[PDB]
Amino acid sequence: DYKAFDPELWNAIDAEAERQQNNIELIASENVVSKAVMAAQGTLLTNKYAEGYPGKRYYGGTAVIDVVETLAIERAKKLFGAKFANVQPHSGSQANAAVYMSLIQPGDTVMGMDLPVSFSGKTYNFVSYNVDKESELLDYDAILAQAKEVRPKLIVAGASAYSRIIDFAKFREIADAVGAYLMVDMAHIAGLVASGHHPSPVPYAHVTTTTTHKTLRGPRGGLILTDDEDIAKKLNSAVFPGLQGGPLEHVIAAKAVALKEALDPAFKEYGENVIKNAAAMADVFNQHPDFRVISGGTNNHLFLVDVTKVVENGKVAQNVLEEVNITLNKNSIPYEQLSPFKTSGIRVGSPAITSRGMGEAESRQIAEWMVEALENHDKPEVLERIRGDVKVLTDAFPLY
Amino acid sequence: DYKAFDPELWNAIDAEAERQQNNIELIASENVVSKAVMAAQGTLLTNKYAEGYPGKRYYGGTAVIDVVETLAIERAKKLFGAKFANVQPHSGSQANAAVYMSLIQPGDTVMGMDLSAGGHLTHGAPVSFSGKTYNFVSYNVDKESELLDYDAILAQAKEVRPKLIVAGASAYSRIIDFAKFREIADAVGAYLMVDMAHIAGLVASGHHPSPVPYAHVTTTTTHKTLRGPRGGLILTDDEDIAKKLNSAVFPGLQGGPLEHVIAAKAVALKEALDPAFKEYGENVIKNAAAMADVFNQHPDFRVISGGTNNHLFLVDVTKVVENGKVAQNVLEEVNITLNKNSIPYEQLSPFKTSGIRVGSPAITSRGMGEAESRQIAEWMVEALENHDKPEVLERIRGDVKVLTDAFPLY
Ligand SMILES: C[As](C)(=O)[O-]
Ligand SMILES: C[As](C)(=O)[O-]
Ligand code: NA
């Protein structure tokens, strides 16, 4: 009965389990992990610190830990079709940083989308590309022309708010045309890569990185993939001892569990439902005349909506929707005119509601509420009614 | 019944539980966390991503997370007597990075306790646009006493002119005088940082003088002697420094924090505020000193500095086996894990070393007392004396099993 020793803490945990149950989570980077992933991170593997890699540990006592890590490695390789995997990065940003350390020098130019900078932002010269102004799509010819001016040593593809399929073969063609490495950060789409709904970057990127959380639905953490053995060896040294000490083996256990879950046929259905639910919500905004969806829609788990014909800015929209138990985030839109603190947009995502079992009917309802709530932002008695309706829905879809 | 879905992973967890049961853990940085700490880490807090600090988050949905994180902050402040605490650093190396970014500039000179007197091993040093990190200049212990000589450290600091002096060690066995370190830093115009990661649990238990009133910034891991989850913590009494630290940690180094791990930090911090934690710290101190005594008395082994006042010590094994690496492999044959380790003025190559490092926290957390600790060190002596005799190693291994069986891990 450990909970009796510390009630303030353990009651706050029940309060969060309750809050999550009454919230509609549309933050596009969020998800809902399995009990098995949680339990894996809650094991006594946290007691064992195991510097180095399997079969090449500094300290002894690591034969079992080597089995666990090898499982995560093999499942990652299998799931994403790569020859080399490193499951030790503590986060997606550590994973990226290792790639920078292994391929380019301090001071080199890196081009990336809509700026994957994190703590590396002062070590390298990051230069941003985004989308064409009219189509709001990637324009590979403009990106090539930009890369010919800037001459990056490394190009990064991947973004946290682009709704459309990325053509990784074209990124690699661009990279090869100016002699740059390609890295892809698939953090946001990794689960859709794993489900088959997004084309894989693995055959085209020199190195691919990802978080294990987000669409892949695992624990917080990183992963790096490559087909090139000389690069693998640099990556492994950059992660340890370059950036990190010993790995979090209990989190690696949880990566294993999540990777197995993503190898299951059922994960393909989840990814289909993610695609469908996002599409359904985007359709509600597309139909309405006072909301515009960026690029006109989505082929992935998210979209951006320009809300400025109905409320002043994306920050206001986020606050209003919090009133009705719906969380999401404000988000700059392409060629954003407003202030980075205000923005003209919101970003809406489907993975978390999909993981609690909601389908297209529910998704469409949720977006009706959003429209309604936003249209009546100044009418607290309306907000309260939507809130009541939201509660009926959350009650019908238990979180665990 | 999730384990039925993945027996290969879940059978491996069971095997590691049993392996820990059968092992005597003497790695000085290891410990055994409570069931509550593990459970906390294994909560649904992992689903909530909350950039910013409590009451100042970017996204909504963060009211309960704020309570959890404020609990950790308040407990850390209360346990360590600090005016400001940041519990978001994902690791001890990050907490250290934040400190460097907040107080000094790339290329500045930093004096720190060398990698063998008993010093750390800097992972993730932040890198400038021109490729500079910091000019690390190390100080040592005195060659004859193997103690810190504060006059020689002052004299060095006057020649070298560091901007930052770092104190704290992964292998020094004696009490550090943090007031003197502060005095030396003030004398040459440097900041003092203390990385208390190894001794934090002893700081918390009253058994090691606190650095907190003397360091401009104190860092630690939440694991090791403090016996919590993997992660970091930064303490300061200066509000202007606190503000820089907080920005360096987020968005400078990290995104959003690991709120489930922060929950586990709150758990551990409360365990450590408990009066029983002071008994744990006493036992830690006693168990280490009992092991060191076996080595002191034996004529073919020498304890660095002649003994210990904390959780660990080093032994020169070179009269008995060729190097610390051999010693480490030999002991593994008997179900005892420790690490090789350089000793002050080490003559052997860093991959061999003259020494082993032994620690008491993990045996203490299993309930072992002085008699057990003494028995363990006699076994090590014997194992090492008979390194080339597998029948003797086998027999010691069988006696280790009787002990481990009598002191269940969980
Ligand atoms: C800034 As994010 C982790 O919500 O894409
Ligand atoms: C570098 As260590 C965590 O074994 O003292
Ligand atoms: Na529309």
- Give the H or E element holding residue B379: helix B370-385
Of the candidates B310, B136, B346, the one whose C-alpha atom is nearest the C-alpha of residue B208 is: B310
Alpha carbon of residue B228 to chain centroid: 11
Distance in angstroms (rounded) separating the CA atoms of residues A213 and A211: 5
Task: Name the pairing type of β-strands B312-316 and B302-303.
Answer: antiparallel
Within 8 A by CB and 6+ apart from A377, the residues are: A310, A311, A316, A320, A383
3-state secondary structure of B347: coil
- Phi, psi dihedrals of residue B258, rounded to the nearest 5°: -95, 100
For residues B392, B397, B403 and B404, what is the CA-based torsion angle, rounded to 10 degrees?
Answer: 170
Dihedrals φ, ψ of B232, to 5°? -125, 170
Of ligand 2's listed atoms, the one at least distance from the Cα of B120 is 1
Strand order in the sheet with B312-316: B302-303, B312-316, B355-359, B339-341
User: Which residues, in sequence order, are bridge partners of residue A293?
Assistant: A305
Q: Which atom of ligand 1 is nearest to the CA of A188?
A: 5
Please give the backbone phi and psi of residue A152, each rounded to the nearest 5 degrees, phi first: -65, 155
The answer to whether the Cα torsion of A358, A360, A361, A366 is positive or negative is: positive
Of A278, A273, A281, A283, nearest to A299 (Cα)?
A278
Q: Where do the H-state alpha helices sit in B44-199? A: 63-80, 92-103, 150-160, 178-188
Indicate yes or no: CB of A38 within 8 angstroms of CB of B40. no
Backbone phi, psi, residue A309, to 5° = -90, -10
Q: Is A212 in the pocket of ligand 1 (CB under 6 A)?
A: no
Q: From B246, B198, B205, B247, select the one nearest B220 (Cα to Cα).
A: B198
For A28, A187, B76, B167, the CA distances from A81, given in Å and listed in that order, are 25, 16, 45, 47
Residues in chain B: 410
CB pairs A-B closer than 8 Å: 226
Q: Please give the angle made by the CA atoms of B38, B44 and B45, to the nearest 5 degrees.
A: 85
DSSP B225: T
Cβ–Cβ under 8 Å, residues A320 and A326: no
A66-98 burial, b for 16+ CB within 10 Å, e for fewer?
bbbbbbbbebbbebbebebbbbbbbbbbbbbbb
Atom of ligand 2 nearest to the CA of B27: 4
Pairwise CA distance, residues B46 & A42, whole Å: 11
Nearest CA of chain A to the CA of B186: how many Å? 30
Pick from B342, B197, B6: which is nearest to A255 by CA?
Answer: B6
Q: In Å, how far is B183's CA from the nearest CA of chain A?
A: 32
Separation CA B213–CA B232 (nearest Å) = 19
Gap between the Cα atoms of A277 and B392, Å rounded: 67
Place of tokens 């360091």: B215
Sign of CA dihedral B171, B176, B182, B188: negative
Our answer on whether the CB atom of A31 is closer than 6 Å to any ligand 1 atom is: no
- Pick from A82, A74, A124, A397: nearest CA to A259: A74
CA angle B363, B364, B370 (to 5 degrees): 95
Asked if residue A29 has its Cβ within 6 Å of ligand 1, the reply is yes
Peptide bond just before B251 cis, omega within 30 deg = yes
In angstroms, the CA A306 to CA A313 distance is 9
Q: Evaluate whether B60 touches B255 at the Cβ level (below 8 Å).
A: no
* C-alpha Rg value of chain A to the nearest Å: 22
Q: Are B226 and B79 in contact (CB under 8 A)?
A: no
Cβ(A160) – ligand 1 distance below 6 Å: yes
Q: What amino acid is encoded at B10 in this protein?
A: W
- Give the dihedral of Cα atoms B56, B60, B65, B71; nearest 10 deg: 30
Q: Residue B391: CB partners within 8 Å, gap ≥ 6?
A: none
| Cα dist from A19 to A8, A30, A399, B46, B308, whole Å | 16, 15, 10, 14, 50
Closest CA–CA distance from residue A3 to any residue of chain B (Å): 7
Chain A residue with minimum CA distance to B42: A42
Nearest to B409 by CA among A47, A246, A251, A248: A47
Does the annotation flag A29 for ligand binding?
no
Distance CA A92, CA B254 (A): 10
A340 is annotated as contributing to ligand binding = yes
Q: Do A9 and B61 touch (CB under 8 A)?
A: no
Q: Is A91 in the pocket of ligand 1 (CB under 6 A)?
A: no
DSSP per position, B244-296? HHHHIIIIII-SS--HHHHHHHHHHHHHHHSHHHHHHHHHHHHHHHHHHHHHH
A30-53 b/e (C-beta count within 10 Å ≥ 16 → b): bbbbbebbbbbbbbbbbbbbbbbb
From CA A351, how far away is CA A335, in angstroms rounded? 27
Q: Which residue has the tokens 């020098």?
A: A105
Ligand 3: centre distance to CA A282 (Å): 9
Q: If you measure from the C-alpha of residue A187 to the centroid of ligand 1, how many angstroms do you get, rounded to a whole number?
A: 10
Helix (H) / strand (E) element for B324: namely helix B324-333
Nearest to A23 by CA among A371, A396, A400, A390: A390
- CB under 8 Å to A29, separation ≥6 — which residues? A160, A188, A213, A214, A349, B49
Distance from the Cα of residue A298 to its chain's centroid: 16
Rounded Cα gap, residues B339 and A347, in angstroms: 50
B9 with A257: Cβ contact below 8 A: yes
Beta-bridge mates of residue B86: B234
Contact (Cβ atoms closer than 8 angstroms) between residue A224 and residue A99: yes
Query: What strands lie across the sheet with A181-185, from one edge to the other?
Result: A84-86, A222-226, A207-211, A181-185, A154-157, A109-113, A125-129
Q: Is B238 helix (H, G, I), strand (E, B) or coil?
A: coil
Q: Test A90 with B90 for CB contact under 8 angstroms.
A: yes
Please state the three-class secondary structure of chain A as a single string.
Answer: CHHHHCHHHHHHHHHHHHHHHHCEECCCCCCCCCHHHHHHHCCHHHHCCCCEECCEECCCCCHHHHHHHHHHHHHHHHHHCCCEEECCCCCHHHHHHHHHHHHCCCCCEEEEECCCCHHHHHCCEEEEECCCCCCCCCCHHHHHHHHHHHCCCEEEECCCCCCCCCCHHHHHHHHHHHCCEEEEECHHHHHHHHHCCCCCCCCCCCEEEEECCCCCCCCCCEEEEECCHHHHHHHHHHHHHHHCCCCCHHHHHHHHHHHHHHHCHHHHHHHHHHHHHHHHHHHHHHHCCCCEEHHHCCCCCEEEEECCCCCCCHHHHHHHHHHCCEECEEECCCCCCCCCCCCCEEEEECHHHHHCCCCHHHHHHHHHHHHHHHHCCCCHHHHHHHHHHHHHHHHHCCCC
A220 is catalytic: yes
Amino acid at B93: S
Contacts of B252 in chain A (CB under 8 A): 119
Extract the annotated binding site of B for (6S)-5,6,7,8-tetrahydrofolate: 115, 119-121, 349-351
- Of A234, A348, A224, A220, the closest CA to residue A291 belongs to A348
Ligand 2 pocket: which of B114, B170, B172 to mutate (most atoms within 8 A of CB): B170
**Is the Cβ atom of A331 under 6 angstroms away from ligand 1?**
no
Which one of A153, A220, A257, A400 makes the best mutation probe of the B interface by having the most chain B beta carbons within 10 Å?
A220
Q: How many Å apart are CA B183 and CA A214, to the nearest integer? A: 49
CA distances to A244, A354, B269, B309, B353 from B314, rounded to whole Å, are 25, 55, 29, 12, 11
* Cβ partners under 8 Å of residue B127, min gap 6: A106, A123, B106, B133
- The yes/no answer on whether domain B36-273 falls in CATH 3.40.640.10 is yes
Is ligand 1 within 6 A of the CB of residue A237? no
Question: From CA A383, how far away is CA A386, in angstroms rounded?
Answer: 5
- Quote the tokens at residue A393: 């829905």
Q: Testing the interface with B: which of A23, A31, A47, A255 to mutate, by most B Cβ within 10 A?
A: A47
Q: Do B127 and A105 touch (CB under 8 A)?
A: no
Residues of A in contact with B33 (CB under 8 A): 44, 46-47
Of the residues B1, B8, B9, the best mutation for testing chain A's interface (the one with the most A CB atoms within 10 Å of its CB) is: B9
Query: Which chain B residues are within 8 Å of A354, Cβ to Cβ?
Result: none
CB contact under 8 A, A61 and B19: yes
The C-alpha atoms of residue B376 and residue B384 are separated, in whole angstroms, by 12
Q: Is A214 part of the annotated catalytic residue set?
A: yes
Does the distance separating the beta carbons of A41 and B16 come in below 8 Å? no
DSSP state of B11: H
- Are the CB atoms for B255 and B24 separated by under 8 Å? no
Please give the distance, rounded to the nearest whole angstrom, from the Cα atom of residue A30 to the centre of ligand 1. Answer: 8
Decide whether any atom of ligand 1 lies within 6 Å of the A300 Cβ: no
Residue B336 makes CB contacts below 8 A (sequence gap 6+) with B23, B24, B26, B376, B379, B380, B383, B400
The phi-psi region of residue B189 (left if phi > 0; otherwise alpha if psi is between -120 and 50; otherwise beta) is left
Cis peptide bond upstream of B106, omega within 30: no
User: What is the number of other CB atoms lying within 10 angstroms of the CB of residue B256?
Assistant: 20
Enter the tokens of residue A179: 């002699």
CA nearest neighbour of A163 among A294, A73, A32: A294
- CA-nearest of B316, B229, B197, B198 to A43 is B229
| CA distance linking residue A34 with residue B314, whole number of Å | 44
Q: Write the residue in B36, B47, B60 that is nearest to A6 by C-beta.
A: B36
- Residue A398: how many CB atoms within 10 A of its CB? 9
DSSP classification of residue B299:
T
Please name the residue of chain B whose CA is at the shortest distance from the CA of residue A101.
B127
Rounded Cα distance, A5 and A3, in Å: 5
Give the separation between CA A218 and CA A32, rounded to whole angstroms: 9
Residue B50, number of CB atoms within 10 A of its CB: 23
Rounded Cα gap, residues B226 and B281, in angstroms: 10
Type of residue numbered A286: N
B349: left (phi over 0), alpha (psi -120 to 50) or beta: beta
Smallest CA–CA distance from A30 into chain B, residue: B47
Query: Is residue B29 within 6 Å of ligand 2 at its C-beta?
Result: yes
Residue of B109, B185, B114, B191 lying closest to B148 (CA atoms) = B114
Report chain B's terminal Cα–Cα distance, integer Å: 22
Using CA atoms, how far apart are residues B226 and B235, in angstroms rounded to an integer?
A: 15
| Shortest CA distance from A29: residue in chain B | B49
Of A315, A332, A363, which Cα lies nearest the Cα of A24? A363
DSSP string, B36-62: HHHHHHTSGGGG----EETTEESSSS-
Determine the residue of chain A that is closest to B229 in CA distance: A46
Decide: A256 and A71 in contact? Cβ < 8 Å: yes
Radius of gyration of chain B from its Cα atoms, rounded to whole angstroms: 22
Is any ligand 1 atom within 6 A of the Cβ of residue A21? no
Which chain A residues are Cβ-neighbours of B60 within 8 angstroms? Answer: 318-319, 322, 327
Q: Choose among A27, A60, A327: nearest Cβ to B337.
A: A60
CA distance B180 to B176: 9
Ligand 1 mutation pick, B46, B47, B51, max ligand atoms within 8 A of CB: B51
The span from the CA of B264 to the CA of A233, in Å, is 35
Q: Please name the residue of chain A whose CA is at the shortest distance from the CA of residue B338.
A: A59
How far apart CA A316 and CA A181 sit, in angstroms, is: 41
Task: Give the tokens for residue B39.
Answer: 């459970």
Residues with Cβ within 8 Å of residue B369, at least 6 apart in sequence: B283, B286, B287
CA distance between the termini of chain A: 22
The residues of B annotated with a catalytic role in the active site are 49, 51, 195, 221, 224, 230
- CA–centroid distance, residue B109 to ligand 3 (Å): 59
Beta partners for A222? A211
CB B112 within 8 A of CB B136: yes
Beta strand B336-337 with A125-129: parallel, antiparallel or unpaired? unpaired
CATH architecture of A37-263: 3-Layer(aba) Sandwich (3.40)
